[PDB]
Design a protein around this nucleic acid. Structure first.
Lengths: 63, 146, 100, 202
RNA sequence: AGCAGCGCCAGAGAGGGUGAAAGCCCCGUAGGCGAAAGGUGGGGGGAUAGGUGAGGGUACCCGAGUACCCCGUGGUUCGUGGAGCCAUGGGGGAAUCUGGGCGGACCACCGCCUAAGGCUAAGUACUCCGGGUGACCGAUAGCGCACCAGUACCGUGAGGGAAAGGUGAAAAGAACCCCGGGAGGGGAGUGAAAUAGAGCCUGAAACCGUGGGCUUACAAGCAGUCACGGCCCCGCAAGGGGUUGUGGCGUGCCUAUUGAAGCAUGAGCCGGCGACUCACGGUCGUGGGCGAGCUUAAGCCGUUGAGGCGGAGGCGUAGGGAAACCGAG
RNA sequence: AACCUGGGGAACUGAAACAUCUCAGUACCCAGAGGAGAGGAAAGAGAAAUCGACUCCCUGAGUAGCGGCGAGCGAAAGGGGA
């Protein structure tokens, strides 16, 4: 009763005013070494998911 | 008007869907018929596959929390002056929450766009935008103090 | 307690059933079952002798226990309900306007 | 609407009413359903296959026995053993928007108005709590017993009177509800009782 | 007690019984009275126990193997984490207010507080117990137990654990006769009813029988089904039913499966019991109410099926950003 | 009967394995208490030069936070009331 906001979720995703789940890009923090500047930049972005994106919004809501 | 015929105004019919019958939702009863259909399965909400949800997306929301937690800090409340210019007079935080925009955020921050009023709007924080439009209207006092 | 009922051994009318109108002197109230007996109900007990002692037991058709809600008492009239007034001393029953 | 009959010694006068114009079927029903379920008492009770007074032992082996396959004599497939999804004491009530009970109370009261089955009274010459008194009174006011009536006054003496009558339901001015305005065919109440309903919405 | 004629009480027309269906017959109901005795009781009164003052000087006092530190620990939202605090197994070990603790490692300032003694009503939980009520059960239900049940019975033992309620308004429970050793029937009789006759109201299905109509002993079958004929049957008539001789056609049910009549699964038969519910929170949809607003939670008052007050809070109006911040950016 | 405080204290189970974790200080064992029990006159709370014993309900709030940051776990002041 009274579902718990999946904590491991919110700690890595934010939901936007519109309602689309923005997520942090993966693949930068370890694989690195000399990844072309063009690499570690295009990775510094955030972005959108899709169908799992809708699974996400299911895990929060009180938030 | 009497008690015969109030009747849920033709559109709310509690018609549940009991699926134990001979025709309709039947036998397997509801969308079943396969297997792994007992007391339910693992999610599907977030979890599953058995691989890795998509918990591959990584934490960035650092400053997520020490062990004490949340710090005693003011919490300025944004509220568009266009939403203020409705009623008139000498508007203050008090007169503001006394309406329906605030809910005790103490700090208020009149700002935004539209048409300010030639009134006095006491507040806890303005915007360089609201400030000037408002100077082109009436007066405006800063915050009290702490 | 409160098993106390309409009346005792005396003159009581019957607005019951098959004996509607029959009025007799009631000779036994049995509070254990809420039934009295007058001269009315008289079913014929074909049985020989109720208890082995004695020769034959007679076809005695004697009174049969009637339900008390089917019996109204009566005095200088024709049977009323029973209100109860009180003296300077003890207390007995007065019917709808009469006495005794 | 605006035409509500008023009964007085000065004769027959009228008041002006600010009751609602158009009536909402459903809305008046939702209000009743609420009223009819907040008073509902969650009581029906059944025992699961654990609350059941049975013991647990595995009745018999499950293997090489030849016989069906059973755990405890509690299993709901068994007889006497716990019901499956048995009704458990609950609260059949919900919080109906106050903005709605009003719009209901206001529509029923405004209904009898539009049906001429309302009557505002002052002169309760049928005083001192004696139904006899009340019945020689209702007469003068019209009430003959043909129509079921809702009586709503703050006058105990007045209440006690018609209180036991079968064609009337007594009531305090406060009690007025969107159900007992739709039970009676009429509705009679103190010029002070309508002065206290119109105090809530008027 | 119904139907009807004419009446009547109601602070009582809740409910229940009376041979059926009663405001009026009964018991009650609404209203109002009542304790020698035991019990209860600051709700009221009374009394006591115990409590109440300033300034100044003095430097006495103010809970000890305790504080506090360390090692091993628990509790807490805190899983050794930057790990405080309360609690303490092990070791060391103060101070009497120019004192000691706490304010999340620690230090400084500034604030909170008086450990290491103890007691305290109320709100709170509970339901063996008594009372009230039910969009609770109605004898395979409801407690296991409506009943002589925690019994019978099973187990050494702990323990487990049944079944089983019904005549009738009243026993008026069938005198006597008849057959029979009895059981049991047949008449007579009781009763409105006895096919309400005693495990007896209702009496279903399986299942067992007796009488009748149709039908079968050269006929091959998932048993049925089309077609016609004979027979028997209700009907003026046309027609309808029951049966079934002949011809045509015809691979049971569920399940499980690529695939079943299948030599795969399950079921002897009938009756009863038997499986997608509920709470809270979501997300759609939908019917409504209100709308830059919508809405109370607990309770307080009222009601004894009567609702109302209660904005604490909640969701909404501004987003971005890890944050500081900024802001229709 | 149940409820209560303290002394002890499970595993299945969930983590779709499984050790930390969970189930849980639940089950049960024990001792003690009473119509209740416990709790209680701040070495308090924590950021208002401010609240002010305790108990409970509502809320705060699935928030702060805890967590092989997995499964999951989950407060406090403050506000409303008794």
């Amino acid at each position: 009763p009274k579902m718990k906001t999946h904590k491991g979720a919110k700690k890595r995703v934010k939901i936007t005013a519109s309602g689309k789940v923005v997520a942090m890009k993966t693949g930068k923090r370890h694989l690195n070494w000399q990844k072309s500047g063009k690499e570690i930049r295009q990775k510094g972005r955030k972005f959108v998911l899709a169908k799992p994106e809708a699974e996400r919004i299911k895990l929060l809501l009180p938030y | 008007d009497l008690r015969p015929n109030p009747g849920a105004n033709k559109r709310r019919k509690r018609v549940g869907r009991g699926p134990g019958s001979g025709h309709g939702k039947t036998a397997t009863r509801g969308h079943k018929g396969q297997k792994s259909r007992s007391g339910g399965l693992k999610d599907p909400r977030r979890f599953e596959g058995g691989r890795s949800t998509t918990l591959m997306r990584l934490p960035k929301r650092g400053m997520q929390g020490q062990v004490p937690g949340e710090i005693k800090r003011p919490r300025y409340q944004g509220v568009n002056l266009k939403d203020l210019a409705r009623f008139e007079g000498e508007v203050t935080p008090e007169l503001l929450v006394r309406a329906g925009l605030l809910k005790k955020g103490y700090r208020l921050k009149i700002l935004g766009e539209g048409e300010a009023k030639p009134l006095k709007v006491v507040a806890h924080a303005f915007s360089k935008s609201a400030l000037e439009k408002l100077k082109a209207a009436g007066g405006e006092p800063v915050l009290l103090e702490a | 307690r409160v098993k106390m009922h309409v009346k005792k051994g005396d003159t009581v009318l019957v607005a019951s059933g098959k004996y509607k109108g029959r009025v007799g002197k009631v000779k036994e109230v049995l509070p254990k079952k809420y039934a009295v007996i007058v001269e009315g109900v008289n079913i014929v007990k074909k049985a020989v002798r109720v208890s082995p002692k004695y020769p034959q037991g007679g076809f005695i058709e004697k009174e049969a226990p009637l339900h008390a809600s089917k019996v109204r008492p009566i005095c200088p009239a024709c049977g009323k309900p029973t209100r109860v007034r009180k003296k300077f001393l003890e207390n007995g029953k007065k019917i709808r306007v009469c006495a005794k | 609407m605006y035409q509500i009959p008023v009964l007085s010694p000065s004769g027959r006068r009228e008041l002006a009413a600010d009751l609602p114009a158009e009536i909402n079927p459903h809305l008046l029903w939702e209000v009743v359903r609420w009223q009819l379920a907040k008073r509902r008492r969650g009581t029906a009770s059944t025992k699961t296959r654990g609350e059941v007074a049975y013991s647990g032992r595995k009745i018999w082996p499950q293997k090489h026995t030849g016989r069906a396959r059973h755990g405890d004599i509690g299993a709901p497939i068994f007889v006497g053993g716990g019901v499956v999804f048995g009704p458990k004491p609950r609260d059949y009530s919900y919080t109906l928007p106050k903005k709605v009970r009003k719009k209901g109370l206001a529509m029923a009261v405004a209904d009898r108005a539009r049906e001429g089955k309302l009557l505002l009274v002052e002169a309760f010459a049928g005083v001192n709590g004696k139904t006899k008194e009340f019945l020689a009174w209702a007469k003068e006011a019209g009430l003959d017993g043909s129509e079921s009536v809702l009586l709503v006054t703050g006058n105990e003496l007045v209440r006690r009177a018609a209180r036991n009558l079968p064609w009337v339901v007594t009531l305090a001015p406060e009690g007025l509800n969107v159900y007992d305005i739709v039970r009676t065919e009429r509705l009679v109440m103190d010029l002070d009782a309508w002065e206290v309903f119109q105090n809530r919405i008027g």
